Design a protein around this ligand. Structure first.
Ligand code: FES
Ligand SMILES: [Mg+2]
Lengths: 49, 135, 86, 12, 225, 100, 26
């Protein structure tokens, strides 16, 4: 099975700024999607599931 | 083995004491910074209580002498049809322009209130200001 | 400590207790600094500062706790509800 | 002597 | 032999100066006033423990005394800078969803951490189970909003005190500052106020990290020769 | 000769305005959700106004508008509550667009 | 001391109390 690698270095500092949420991968994705929706505003089926 | 009794003293006192007792082998990274530059109030838990009987909060209402002039101006002439621009830190409304003229004439020695108010309206009309009385 | 088995309750209580340690000030490392009289719920505890050699003349549980703190000389009287947790 | 805890047995 | 000199020239030297990072140059009572930091909630929402910090009520709207905010902000920024200098883990916490994106970006930009999401029970008090026995917890928690979305204190305020982590917190007139180590009375709602706070902490943290590298680099160059 | 906070507060437009009820103010649209316009007008809290039926497309992010203020903060204490409930928004009526 | 400090006084903007349609009438 896929194992997530160690999330902090020898000094103990986590690599990801969203580590302490416990869901850094999920919330980093929501952060990226929310950021894209913002940039659009500033600028402005059958075969897929 | 830091103590989790957050309602007993403060993080500084609990940390300082366990360091003396030898329970904590090393001081935390923040302890020396807190000691050198402590807060104004030591962060000690307190239970908030409702006031009873004749106890009142010590907060006072903020009032100024010019508020009396502003209250009368809004009663007599209403709010100006000009729109407030609260983003401009130096914005002056018709009421503030009225208040400043009212203050100038008061410093010229006039002391009557009803007379000092009518002369102010005339001065602004001479300057081209629109003062539509509400009634 | 709570558990179905007694040995598990012992483990939980004692391991948790070290995370909720108080520091108790002692006069000359043997007694309290002043007489302490307080009520906790319905349990009244009156404690008296004592000189060296007086020993622990207190409720047996207070004796046990005082040896863990390091108090050697104190008088205490418990009145009202005698509840171990209170 | 409370029997000492043994986490290793059920370790994944 | 060489460690005592290291810790003395690098870790103990900044602690002998009242403003080692010059954080007083970052703000002024005027800069705070333009950001609307003095604006508090209505008197009916006032928390009793905030009365000492309230200048007064202007037509039933509480006004925060910026003279006190200025002194409290100096202490909080100074503390925050010293902790960043010492390479502490700084965690920003706020549940105000209007500013979640802004705060998460500010944390990433300064090289720190943000928790703007739902706070799950035990992130701090049960971290070893959730993250692992070797997990390092934050050395400083900065609250830009100390209340959760039901207008109660964020659970992390209580749990930060339980874990003996110092807290910096913006405390509005409806907040409880008793357990916040370095409270800063100020408006937490206005976008101009919140943006200002993020700039000040971001700048304080970034400056302290650059200062740490300058001192270390100099201490090494001089050590060889 | 550093200006004091008491001086800033006395001479601020928000202090000079007095009561906010029935006061015309200029706002700026900073966020839009469907036909909900979030308008900042210099106070602590923004107001939320529905897009007007006439010239609805003229109301965009950054568009400056005219408002008639009702309350700077909507708050009320309800039966059994120890503190006032606040919705964290101002009450205002959107009149139209401000033009030069 | 300082001229810009607030002064103690009664609310100048206070609205007159509302009256019933029969207030003052027999
Ligand atoms: S309000 Fe009814 S008699 Fe005055
Ligand atoms: Mg607030």
């Amino acid at each position: 099975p896929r194992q997530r690698a160690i999330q902090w270095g020898e000094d103990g500092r986590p690599f990801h700024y969203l580590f302490y949420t416990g869901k850094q991968s999920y919330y980093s994705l929501m952060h990226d999607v929310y950021g894209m929706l913002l940039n659009l505003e500033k600028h402005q089926v059958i075969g897929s599931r | 083995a830091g103590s989790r009794l957050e309602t007993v003293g403060s993080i500084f006192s609990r940390t300082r004491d366990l360091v003396r007792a030898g329970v904590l082998k090393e001081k935390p990274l923040w302890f020396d910074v807190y000691d050198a530059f402590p807060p104004l109030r030591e962060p000690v838990f307190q239970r908030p209580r409702v006031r009873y009987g004749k106890a009142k909060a010590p907060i006072q209402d903020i009032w100024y002498h010019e508020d009396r002039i502003r209250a009368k101006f809004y009663s007599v002439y209403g709010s100006g049809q000009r729109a407030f621009d609260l983003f401009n830190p130096n914005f002056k409304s018709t009421c503030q322009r009225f208040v400043e003229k009212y203050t100038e004439l008061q410093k010229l020695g006039e002391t009557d209130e009803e007379k000092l108010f009518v002369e102010t309206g005339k001065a602004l009309l001479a300057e081209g200001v629109i003062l539509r009385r509400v009634g | 400590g709570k558990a179905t088995d007694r040995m598990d309750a012992f483990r939980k209580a004692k391991n948790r207790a070290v995370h909720h340690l108080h520091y108790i000030e002692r006069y000359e490392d043997h007694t309290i600094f002043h007489d302490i009289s307080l009520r906790f719920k319905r349990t009244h505890i009156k404690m008296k500062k004592q000189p060296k050699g007086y020993g622990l003349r207190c409720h047996r549980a207070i004796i046990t706790i005082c040896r863990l703190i390091g108090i050697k000389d104190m008088y205490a009287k418990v009145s009202g509800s005698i509840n171990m947790l209170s | 002597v409370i029997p000492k805890k043994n986490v290793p047995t059920s370790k994944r | 032999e060489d460690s005592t000199d290291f810790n003395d020239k690098i870790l103990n030297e900044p602690l002998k100066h009242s403003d080692f990072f010059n954080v007083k140059e970052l703000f002024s009572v005027r800069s705070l006033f333009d950001a609307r930091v003095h604006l508090g909630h209505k008197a009916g929402c006032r928390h009793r423990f905030m009365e000492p910090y309230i200048f007064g009520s202007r037509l039933d709207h509480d006004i925060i005394d910026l003279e006190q905010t200025a002194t409290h902000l100096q202490l909080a920024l100074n503390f925050t800078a010293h902790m960043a200098y010492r390479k502490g883990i700084i965690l920003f916490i706020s549940r105000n969803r209007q500013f979640s994106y802004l705060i998460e970006n500010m944390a990433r930009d300064c090289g720190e951490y943000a928790h703007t999401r739902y706070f799950r029970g035990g992130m701090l008090t049960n971290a070893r189970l959730l993250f692992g026995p070797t997990v390092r917890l934050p050395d400083l928690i900065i609250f830009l909003h100390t209340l959760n979305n039901i207008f109660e204190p964020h659970v992390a305020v209580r749990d930060a005190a339980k874990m003996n982590i110092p807290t910096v917190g913006i405390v509005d007139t409806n907040c409880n500052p008793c357990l916040i180590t370095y409270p800063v009375p100020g408006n937490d709602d206005s976008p101009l106020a919140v943006h200002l706070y993020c700039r000040l902490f971001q700048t304080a943290i970034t400056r302290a990290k650059e200062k740490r590298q300058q001192v270390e680099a100099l201490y090494r160059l001089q050590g060889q020769k | 000769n550093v200006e004091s906070f008491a001086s800033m507060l006395r001479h601020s437009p928000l202090t000079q305005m007095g009561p906010a009820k029935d006061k015309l103010v200029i706002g700026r649209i900073f966020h839009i959700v469907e036909n909900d316009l979030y308008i900042d007008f210099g106070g602590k809290f923004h107001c939320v106004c529905r897009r007007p039926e006439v010239d609805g497309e003229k109301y965009q992010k950054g568009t400056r508008v005219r408002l008639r203020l009702l309350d700077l903060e909507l708050t009320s204490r309800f039966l059994g509550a120890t503190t006032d409930t606040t919705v964290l928004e101002a009450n205002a009526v959107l009149l139209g667009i401000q033009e030069s | 001391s300082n001229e810009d400090l607030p002064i103690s006084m009664e609310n100048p903007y206070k609205e007159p109390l509302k009256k019933c349609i029969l207030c003052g009438k027999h």
